[PDB]
Design a protein around this ligand. Sequence first.
Ligand SMILES: OC[C@H]1O[C@H](O[C@H]2[C@H](O)[C@@H](O)[C@@H](O[C@H]3[C@H](O)[C@@H](O)[C@@H](O)O[C@@H]3CO)O[C@@H]2CO)[C@H](O)[C@@H](O)[C@@H]1O
Ligand SMILES: OC[C@H]1O[C@H](O[C@H]2[C@H](O)[C@@H](O)[C@@H](O)O[C@@H]2CO)[C@H](O)[C@@H](O)[C@@H]1O
Ligand code: BGC
Ligand code: PCA
Ligand code: CA
Ligand code: CL
Length: 495
Amino acid sequence: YSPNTQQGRTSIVHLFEWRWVDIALECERYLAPKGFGGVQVSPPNENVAIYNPFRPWWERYQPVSYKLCTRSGNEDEFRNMVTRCNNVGVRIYVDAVINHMCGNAVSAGTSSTCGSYFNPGSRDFPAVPYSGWDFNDGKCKTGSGDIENYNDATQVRDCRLTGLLDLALEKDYVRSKIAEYMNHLIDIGVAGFRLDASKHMWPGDIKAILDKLHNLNSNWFPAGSKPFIYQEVIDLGGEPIKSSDYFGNGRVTEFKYGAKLGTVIRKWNGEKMSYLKNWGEGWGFMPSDRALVFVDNHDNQRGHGAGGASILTFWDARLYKMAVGFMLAHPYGFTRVMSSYRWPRQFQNGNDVNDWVGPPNNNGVIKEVTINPDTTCGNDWVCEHRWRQIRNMVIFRNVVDGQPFTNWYDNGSNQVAFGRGNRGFIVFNNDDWSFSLTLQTGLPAGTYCDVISGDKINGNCTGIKIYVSDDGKAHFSISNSAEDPFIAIHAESKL
Ligand SMILES: OC[C@H]1O[C@H](O[C@H]2[C@H](O)[C@@H](O)[C@@H](O[C@H]3[C@H](O)[C@@H](O)[C@@H](O)O[C@@H]3CO)O[C@@H]2CO)[C@H](O)[C@@H](O)[C@@H]1O
Ligand SMILES: OC[C@H]1O[C@H](O[C@H]2[C@H](O)[C@@H](O)[C@@H](O)O[C@@H]2CO)[C@H](O)[C@@H](O)[C@@H]1O
Ligand SMILES: OC[C@H]1O[C@@H](O)[C@H](O)[C@@H](O)[C@@H]1O
Ligand SMILES: *C(=O)[C@@H]1CCC(=O)N1
Ligand SMILES: [Ca+2]
Ligand SMILES: [Cl-]
């Protein structure tokens, strides 16, 4: 349940579709000095090379083998990345696609990221190797062989998720091949895993696989360390499968988090920020120490997965930064920040016809992440984790780690504020009028740099300054027209 991050680092960032060499550099030049705890990487195992449409991001969720050979790089580049990141105190978490192999309708051949041969039709994946009896064909009871009804917990686990060949995870052979892959990664140095499509695997089968795993690499982790496990389970209620069924294996993705926060920030369905006073289990969420929270993820930012019209993404930058800021300031769960790439989003009758578009590329070859002079990224990589407003809140979370949620204030509408012990304080104005008020910050007297509008740089503030008096009170004035309608100050932004 522990992320295994360096003490003091409290977040992980999803560098979606980034190449290993770029992540390695990012760890050294940015993530380590800015206090990021780790990186969730895209699936590092060989996948199907899909040509229609042209190299979609989702081809990486169709395994062909467990060779560490993808568009992100080969095994040496992967090992190089893990070593360099661990050496600067930044962890690597692998997106483990272990529930299935490729789509059952994919043509047999060598159209894979490492050239390995595979034949979906005959259930032949010799690079593993897996054959017909390693899949759930005879186990599934639906007429199509695919999952047709989520109200039936059994078929959700034994049938094919959108046609993806379903591995027979009850078999010790299959469990062992998966463990072999995961242990290869653990020994290289990874700190944990995102277990993809966990809802589609029996909790008991996952347990059997995790039981075969090694302790983390003893060069970087204390003896007896166990990999951090966060399971992707979309549980919004209304289905028989519950997130709690997976608590014995590790943490679980709390999809209710971003769905509701999005609704609240958009001020939809009668919701408002003043209601966030009891944010957390009070809102029906799972226990804090079992939750992996996020505003958006790689699926729902593009309408995939549970989707949801309320989800906030970089496309709605202003509200997004506020949502991410609230998340990073609030003690609930372990936080994951999304880092995306831009694609030509085009809605036709409510559906984005380009929701498949893969990462920036030159005829299939992923583009490097270039860093602009102002520290933003080029080549259409959004790099939300480099946005000052988000990066500074990442450190805010580190600075206030362990401090209690306190000094809450709300105007009965959308102007709220709260502190974390005596280490940090944050103020939000999401109402259609100015927030002008003197509030108890719980902080020591002094001059604090607002880390949303600027930074503290050698004795100065490059943005707004907040003055906390002897009684801990400070005046805040945030116009509803502000491009960033929130202010945050903490122990380390004090002059
Ligand atoms: O020997 C030729 C044969 O090699 C490969 O077969 C593998 C199977 O595909 C794979 O399932 C596994 O078989 C094991 C069963 O899963 C397990 O239940 C139990 O019966 O032990 C079996 C042997 O370990 O391993 C075999 C051997 O690697 C390849 O996939 C076949 O196409 C090929 O004919
Ligand atoms: O826990 C792992 C195990 O779960 C399932 O077992 C089923 C069983 O097959 C059914 O007959 C009935 O007893 O419900 C059980 C689950 O409560 C999977 O079927 C099995 O493959 C898997 O290993
Ligand atoms: O590229 C970085 C920038 O992206 C923007 O569109 C966000 O709204 C900015 O606040 C951020 O500084
Ligand atoms: C938590 O993520 C890991 C897996 C379960 C455990 O005991 N440690
Ligand atoms: Ca399954
Ligand atoms: Cl996820």
